Amino acid sequence: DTICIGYHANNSTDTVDTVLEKNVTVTHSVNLLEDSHNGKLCRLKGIAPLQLGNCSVAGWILGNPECELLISRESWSYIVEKPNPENGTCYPGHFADYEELREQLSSVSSFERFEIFPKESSWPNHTTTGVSASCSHNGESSFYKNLLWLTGKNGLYPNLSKSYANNKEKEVLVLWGVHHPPNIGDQRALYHKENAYVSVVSSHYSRKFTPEIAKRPKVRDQEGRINYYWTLLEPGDTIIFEANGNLIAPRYAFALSRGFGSGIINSNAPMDECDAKCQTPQGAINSSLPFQNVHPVTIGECPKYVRSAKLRMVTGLRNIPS
Amino acid sequence: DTICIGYHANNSTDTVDTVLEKNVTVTHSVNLLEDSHNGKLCRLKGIAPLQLGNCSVAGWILGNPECELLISRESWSYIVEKPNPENGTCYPGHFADYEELREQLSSVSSFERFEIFPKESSWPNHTTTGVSASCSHNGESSFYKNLLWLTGKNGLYPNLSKSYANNKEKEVLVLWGVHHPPNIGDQRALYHKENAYVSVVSSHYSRKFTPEIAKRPKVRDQEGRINYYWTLLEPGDTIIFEANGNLIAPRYAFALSRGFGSGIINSNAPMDECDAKCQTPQGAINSSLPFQNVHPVTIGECPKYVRSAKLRMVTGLRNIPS
Amino acid sequence: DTICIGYHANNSTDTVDTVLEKNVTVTHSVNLLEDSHNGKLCRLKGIAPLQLGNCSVAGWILGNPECELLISRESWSYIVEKPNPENGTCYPGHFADYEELREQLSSVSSFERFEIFPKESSWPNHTTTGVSASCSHNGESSFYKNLLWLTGKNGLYPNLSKSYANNKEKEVLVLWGVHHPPNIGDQRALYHKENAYVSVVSSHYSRKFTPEIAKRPKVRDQEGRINYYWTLLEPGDTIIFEANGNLIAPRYAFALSRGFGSGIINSNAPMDECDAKCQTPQGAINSSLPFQNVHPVTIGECPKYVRSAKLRMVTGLRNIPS
Amino acid sequence: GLFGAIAGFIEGGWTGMVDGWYGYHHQNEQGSGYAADQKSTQNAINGITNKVNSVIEKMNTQFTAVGKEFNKLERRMENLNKKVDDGFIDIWTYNAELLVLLENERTLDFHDSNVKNLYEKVKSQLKNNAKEIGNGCFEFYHKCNDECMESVKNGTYDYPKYSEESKLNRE
Amino acid sequence: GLFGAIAGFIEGGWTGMVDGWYGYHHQNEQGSGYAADQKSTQNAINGITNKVNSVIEKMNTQFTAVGKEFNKLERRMENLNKKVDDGFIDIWTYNAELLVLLENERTLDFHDSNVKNLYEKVKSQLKNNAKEIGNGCFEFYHKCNDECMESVKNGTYDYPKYSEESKLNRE
Amino acid sequence: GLFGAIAGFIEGGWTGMVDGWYGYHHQNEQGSGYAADQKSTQNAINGITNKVNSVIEKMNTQFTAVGKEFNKLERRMENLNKKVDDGFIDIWTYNAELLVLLENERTLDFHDSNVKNLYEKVKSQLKNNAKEIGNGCFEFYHKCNDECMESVKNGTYDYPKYSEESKLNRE
Ligand SMILES: *[C@@H]1O[C@H](CO)[C@@H](O[C@@H]2O[C@H](CO)[C@@H](O[C@@H]3O[C@H](CO)[C@@H](O)[C@H](O[C@H]4O[C@H](CO)[C@@H](O)[C@H](O)[C@@H]4O)[C@@H]3O)[C@H](O)[C@H]2NC(C)=O)[C@H](O)[C@H]1NC(C)=O
Ligand SMILES: *[C@@H]1O[C@H](CO)[C@@H](O[C@@H]2O[C@H](CO)[C@@H](O[C@@H]3O[C@H](CO)[C@@H](O)[C@H](O[C@H]4O[C@H](CO)[C@@H](O)[C@H](O)[C@@H]4O)[C@@H]3O)[C@H](O)[C@H]2NC(C)=O)[C@H](O)[C@H]1NC(C)=O
Ligand SMILES: *[C@@H]1O[C@H](CO)[C@@H](O[C@@H]2O[C@H](CO)[C@@H](O[C@@H]3O[C@H](CO)[C@@H](O)[C@H](O[C@H]4O[C@H](CO)[C@@H](O)[C@H](O)[C@@H]4O)[C@@H]3O)[C@H](O)[C@H]2NC(C)=O)[C@H](O)[C@H]1NC(C)=O
Ligand SMILES: CC(=O)Nc1ccc2oc(-c3ccnc(C(=O)N4CCN([C@H](c5ccccc5)c5nnn(C)n5)CC4)c3)nc2c1
Ligand SMILES: CC(=O)Nc1ccc2oc(-c3ccnc(C(=O)N4CCN([C@H](c5ccccc5)c5nnn(C)n5)CC4)c3)nc2c1
Ligand SMILES: CC(=O)Nc1ccc2oc(-c3ccnc(C(=O)N4CCN([C@H](c5ccccc5)c5nnn(C)n5)CC4)c3)nc2c1
Ligand SMILES: *[C@@H]1O[C@H](CO)[C@@H](O[C@@H]2O[C@H](CO)[C@@H](O[C@@H]3O[C@H](CO)[C@@H](O)[C@H](O)[C@@H]3O)[C@H](O)[C@H]2NC(C)=O)[C@H](O)[C@H]1NC(C)=O
Ligand SMILES: *[C@@H]1O[C@H](CO)[C@@H](O[C@@H]2O[C@H](CO)[C@@H](O[C@@H]3O[C@H](CO)[C@@H](O)[C@H](O)[C@@H]3O)[C@H](O)[C@H]2NC(C)=O)[C@H](O)[C@H]1NC(C)=O
Ligand SMILES: *[C@@H]1O[C@H](CO)[C@@H](O[C@@H]2O[C@H](CO)[C@@H](O[C@@H]3O[C@H](CO)[C@@H](O)[C@H](O)[C@@H]3O)[C@H](O)[C@H]2NC(C)=O)[C@H](O)[C@H]1NC(C)=O
Ligand SMILES: *[C@@H]1O[C@H](CO)[C@@H](O[C@@H]2O[C@H](CO)[C@@H](O)[C@H](O)[C@H]2NC(C)=O)[C@H](O)[C@H]1NC(C)=O
Ligand SMILES: *[C@@H]1O[C@H](CO)[C@@H](O[C@@H]2O[C@H](CO)[C@@H](O)[C@H](O)[C@H]2NC(C)=O)[C@H](O)[C@H]1NC(C)=O
Ligand SMILES: *[C@@H]1O[C@H](CO)[C@@H](O[C@@H]2O[C@H](CO)[C@@H](O)[C@H](O)[C@H]2NC(C)=O)[C@H](O)[C@H]1NC(C)=O
Ligand SMILES: *[C@@H]1O[C@H](CO)[C@@H](O[C@@H]2O[C@H](CO)[C@@H](O)[C@H](O)[C@H]2NC(C)=O)[C@H](O)[C@H]1NC(C)=O
Ligand SMILES: *[C@@H]1O[C@H](CO)[C@@H](O[C@@H]2O[C@H](CO)[C@@H](O)[C@H](O)[C@H]2NC(C)=O)[C@H](O)[C@H]1NC(C)=O
């Protein structure tokens, strides 16, 4: 009659690393490192994202003609932009503080699109039909759907001075442009003046733009430029535009609703009818593990990103069988 | 006859967490997490702070009339500003690089206030009595005590060109303003000129300001603005002001003495006759523990802030009594 | 007959710290903290660095006359600049975005120097011989070797409009200047005009400079200034200069080749015929240890910097002899 | 092992025991068999469960954190943003890998301690009513049916009930 | 416990011992009583004091660090500043909590080791002049007055001075 | 020590043993001498080598990282860059120093465990053919030439080959 004390063994090939010995074969272990993803852009807690397609943030927010599919979207969990978009500023120019505007839109959960200066009620003494072949649509010249290129009307460009009060109880994003023609002939030919000015003033924003006429390289068959500008209007503030020429007037504006957890990501993964709590540019993550090596850019409730290839924690014993 | 070996026990309810077991009742323990504060703004090693009251940093440094109580303070351990101050730029305008000036003043331990351009010895051909109802004091119109609104004298605004050499062996903070009237009538009516200029130049600072006349929204019953500007003057450098109008001339300047450990905090806690080595916006901390969860903003010699609710370290044994 | 079980001892004075006891004398230990360096600037994997001497980054890249020794260097492992250089902008002025240009050059492994606008083939109607006593060389007045001070030729300053296309398949660094004379007499006396302009435009860079005439303090026996400007030209883009005066034209340009591991350091250590894999401002490090307390600024493959004075890890036993 | 049990005086493991970590192996007149001690095994399961749980709990949920854009004149700020991101990633990687290493070692040491303590328990029960053959087994000096075996397993062995028999058999 | 003493073969603690952590309990003809072993207890106090001291010393004094202001066109830099502050706070929180967990476990293990080692010391002193009853007590095979008890406490027990008596009483 | 061997029931170390960490000391009719046990010492060398190697491996190579310049209107960004650099330096300093402390303690504990386990091995070999004098030595109850000593060293001692002799000498 005998009794013995011993310990478990099995055919487990699970290996972990220890401080005294690498590659220790153990009986039971748990992997703490998530490396799998579905390779698709999914909904975040049911709410779908905003796919920009071939449109950039500038093209989406300025109303590029090839981005009309994006106007109907006014709520999303996050924003997907292709790594290098195709349809951005169709008329060349400099977008002032573009990255800051991207950062502002990264914390937006929804907005309300409304025409702040309706195209057929605001400038009775100005022409509102200016288009360009550089911003073409369906083969014909066109222009941004959120801006209005004021040109000459009956041979005169009167002094315009409009304003808007914030009747929306939220922040209102306003965008406009300033035209810079290539030569003096097109300048006088378009605005009937030689020394024009644009003036935008709010309670705490104040800037004055002067057109700079010079010979510039061709960009999309255009020698003139249009510098783009934007501002945030607090609830209750009034914005004042005064111009006598070279003003790309605002047409539509956006009443912003803030929200956390959203952001702008660059991804080529396709959208799918999937739902997840964690989204990365590589794909959605469906896991409850504390670590992941899929991607450092995360949206939602994700595991903490690490550069590790293996994080296996032993629960059982050193497997010493037969 | 018997002898036994055993271990201590007591009525201690101290509990700590372990890796194998939570809520382990132990005999002796030490708390490493400070959570208590006195809820008051105290002196830092005997030196009292600078309470701004209803005045902002801009209002304090520009000489707002409702901030005369703050002129006598020229040494402090740190600066307290109310979360949203009331009396800042009483005459509306844009304060250029306001946050950078705040950061500069965050490392100042004391300064010397002196009138760099005495109000009755510098502009014999100009008027130095301009006041505004927007900067009122005791019900009557007034103006900043560190600036001088040069207006018309006997119907002319001559070309002024003054300068100052740094005879103080320290950095000298200089502030000035540029006036922007609403219309042309007040412009010509105030400075007797139609196209004025301001020019400030040092050895490495150089800027030229042009007045921008436009219709602006009312802020404190004012349509005109005053853009505020500042600069640091190294020991030995000379600053040159040249102007023919629209110059809010400097009156007083500040010779800065640098110092570490100071800063600007937002707090509603009241000042008291207490002394401490550690100050937070919630209150002063009197502790020798390595951690604290009171507030991340600290001044002086403080414990390291953590988000933990409990950090108790066991010194005794597992309490297993009766 | 007896047999015993015991452990090793020796005359080792090695001490380590433990959690229960400080200053434990042990039999064997390994130091993990590198504190030694050779106090010299060495080659990084055979490639020598770029010693600027008494020249700053601005003086080196603008072609300061006292920096001709630095023109022959077109490849380096890293850049050494003296803590406060002597020969920088010899003609006073403001260098726009100087720190950003430093950061750009920190990731440059080599470049090709070539005269983009040869001094005797580009401006047949302008003078290209302007020099200054503030930028003297060998006691006589001189000027930058990478810029060209266009002055008056036969009593006229015609309208110049040149351009350059990027025929180099790499980024091309272009530098130029804008002259600001002290008074109107020297302005008209130098450029035969009263209201001049400079205009630099690329596909995405566009700026227009206007000369500002004012009385400025003397810097190196000069009251006028020269504001310095630069830009990066992408492969394939065309840069256009249009000017009628006050243009310090570009002479030489640089085709940049990017590279990782390089940087700009401030050091007084002398260069020597040594080679190392790790370089610090204090000197080169020749070690395989994981930690170092020599300096936080590192170039190459270095140990991780820590503030510790001693990091000794015990390998043997507690030394308990005799 | 730190406590000399696993891979120590007990040389190998038992594949035949499939219901627990630490257990027994009895062979009497009624037969032989393996059976896992449920108290010690359950204690180990609780402790290790709480350990892994603590590791996961100290890793709070990573919420939304995306990259940022910078124009051509913001290279210093772009490189600072990268330095921050890369630095935090490096620190969290180091923390995870080092934690897993050290606590893996301490887990194996924990099992070794559990086996050593179980052996010492059974030894303290049997006393001199059985001899300590190697490999962590006990050779009984008396008769031990399934009743007695199960009395040893649940820690209720009766020492005086066999002292006469064992003292006789020890000759 | 790792060393099987505390909550092991010694099942509970003594509230009656109020002058130390690890101690004794003697009962002879002259009476009974508790008394804490001062050498082992003092060693534990020194080691744990140095441990807590090391923890506090590695946490250097946090000096002045206040927030920063950013205008409406500096949202990226504001969010970078926040990312830095929040990141460092998260890392220091993780460090503190994890350190306290692990070193709490190692402290209890340290006490368990001290008790086990003390018991092994007394056992190595008594040898076969006393039998090992359970719960970590020794039943003497000879007479042991306060002189002999205090000889066992300070580790100066005389084995041959009672070998005849114990060998007679063991019958 | 955690395992009561080093600075425990074995009071001191042997300067006369110069070829290893843990070893023996035999004295028979043929003479005396020290000799290090190569298996245990080699295991300790492997484990500690892998420990230091793991520490170095988790410290990845620090590549180029230099300071940055900021103009007079970039004091907030300069102070943010400094905050980042200083913060990462503080965290890495804390990590290094704390790691070295704790793993130093665990290394000494590891040696203590190796000595305790070796002593328990030799004891489990000799059984009652020798008595346990203090200080971790065994007094043989029989004759043991160099053949027998080397049989004890390499763990191949024969117990029944001397049971008669030892039982006679134990009287
Ligand atoms: C997203 O992630 C979730 C969470 O991991 C994941 O759901 C999980 O799926 C696995 C596998 O389908 C589930 O594991 C099973 O659990 C059930 C119930 O506990 C068990 O019966 C299974 O055990 C064994 O059973 C078989 C024999 O009967 C064995 O042959 C087999 O190999 C199993 O070992 C099995 O373990 C797990 O329970 C769920 N988790 C949850 C919370 O539901 C999901 O699949 C992922 N993907 C998607 C698209 O959701
Ligand atoms: C600011 O922080 C300091 C530092 O903590 C703090 O001073 C401390 O106050 C406590 C409580 O008043 C002191 O603790 C006492 O220490 C004395 C001397 O060591 C002991 O006699 C006391 O022990 C017991 O005595 C009583 C019986 O006689 C017991 O009933 C009682 O409950 C005690 O357990 C007691 O522990 C501590 O010494 C000081 N520390 C210093 C450095 O002075 C101070 O109160 C805080 N607040 C302010 C406004 O300063
Ligand atoms: C740069 O760093 C490298 C790396 O550390 C360094 O090279 C090293 O130099 C040391 C000392 O010269 C070498 O250590 C020696 O190694 C040899 C071969 O392993 C041993 O024979 C030596 O052992 C002992 O020998 C003597 C008796 O024979 C003893 O009296 C003496 O004290 C020694 O203890 C000795 O340990 C080491 O091997 C090299 N490492 C490499 C990779 O070559 C170099 O010197 C540094 N400086 C420069 C300018 O390169
Ligand atoms: C996201 C996530 O993964 N979270 C998570 C959290 C906490 C965990 O804790 C554990 C965990 C603990 C302790 N042990 C085992 C484990 O691997 N076991 C396998 C072996 N098994 C043995 C066992 C031993 C030998 C053969 C068969 C079973 C057993 N004994 N008795 N029972 C009832 N089961 C115990 C549990 C596993 N996994 C965990 C996973
Ligand atoms: C800022 C700060 O708090 N710093 C700090 C630093 C280092 C510390 O170290 C310790 C510390 C160490 C070790 N032990 C105890 C402890 O809790 N003790 C209570 C029990 N006491 C027992 C004890 C045991 C049982 C009953 C009564 C006392 C004892 N034994 N002998 N003496 C003289 N005292 C020892 C000390 C406490 N506290 C520390 C606190
Ligand atoms: C950059 C760098 O330094 N990397 C690095 C990496 C891994 C290391 O691992 C070690 C290391 C491990 C384990 N031990 C000793 C050590 O200090 N030894 C000295 C004692 N020596 C004893 C020893 C003991 C007593 C007297 C003489 C030798 C021995 N025993 N047998 N041999 C063959 N040697 C073993 C090795 C040293 N150093 C390491 C260093
Ligand atoms: C280690 O050994 C275990 C057995 O203890 C192996 O697990 C078993 O693997 C087999 C296939 O190799 C599984 O067989 C399947 O069984 C189901 C149900 O009986 C049957 O419907 C299937 O058609 C198939 O035959 C078996 O289920 C599985 N055991 C368990 C409990 O899941 C394991 O595969 C071995 N490891 C390796 C690496 O071989
Ligand atoms: C656990 O038990 C301890 C006793 O060992 C308790 O500590 C004691 O608590 C009492 C009150 O409950 C204190 O009584 C006071 O004594 C002083 C001096 O004698 C007297 O002046 C007061 O009027 C009061 O009666 C006693 O001092 C205190 N002992 C010590 C050493 O401080 C403890 O309260 C118990 N824990 C719990 C949670 O009940
Ligand atoms: C601790 O003791 C060791 C000896 O076990 C000391 O190491 C030895 O130190 C002496 C000098 O003090 C070295 O002597 C030299 O020997 C070489 C070769 O024989 C000879 O050519 C030289 O002229 C010199 O005499 C000896 O080599 C060295 N032993 C070894 C193995 O390197 C050690 O110095 C002592 N520690 C302290 C702090 O004194
Ligand atoms: C860890 O150990 C296992 C075995 O203990 C290794 O698995 C074997 O690796 C060799 C390569 O050297 C192969 O030839 C065998 O076929 C493997 N065995 C099986 C069952 O597949 C494993 O490679 C080791 N890991 C490392 C990183 O060395
Ligand atoms: C939107 O993007 C498409 C390409 O994705 C543009 O199409 C290009 O138009 C330019 C016009 O100068 C042509 O030179 C290219 O050959 C066209 N490429 C393709 C693939 O069609 C289109 O013009 C863009 N439209 C707007 C309004 O930006
Ligand atoms: C930790 O354990 C203690 C007791 O060991 C718990 O204290 C008791 O908690 C219950 C609630 O489940 C109360 O009903 C008792 O009155 C408490 N006891 C006393 C003396 O107050 C304590 O709640 C446990 N902590 C946690 C977090 O579960
Ligand atoms: C200082 O702040 C007080 C309020 O804290 C200002 O008082 C307000 O003045 C405005 C003037 O337009 C009135 O409309 C408000 O009704 C006043 N409020 C209160 C509570 O008095 C005061 O004008 C400020 N003075 C300066 C110089 O800035
Ligand atoms: C290069 O630096 C040297 C000094 O390192 C300059 O020499 C100084 O020139 C100024 C001219 O105003 C004199 O006032 C100093 O006395 C000179 N000092 C020395 C030590 O020579 C030199 O002028 C610089 N040259 C250029 C082109 O920048």
Ligand SMILES: *[C@@H]1O[C@H](CO)[C@@H](O)[C@H](O)[C@H]1NC(C)=O
């Ligand atoms: C967007 O680009 C893709 C190229 O992958 C093209 O197939 C598609 O027609 C484009 N759509 C629009 C609206 O430009």
Ligand SMILES: *[C@@H]1O[C@H](CO)[C@@H](O)[C@H](O)[C@H]1NC(C)=O
């Ligand atoms: C400051 O504001 C408080 C409001 O809490 C008011 O009571 C007090 O009179 C104000 N003082 C000044 C000087 O404005």
Ligand SMILES: *[C@@H]1O[C@H](CO)[C@@H](O)[C@H](O)[C@H]1NC(C)=O
């Ligand atoms: C550089 O400065 C040093 C001063 O240490 C001087 O000796 C040397 O002549 C200078 N060289 C040039 C080219 O200016």
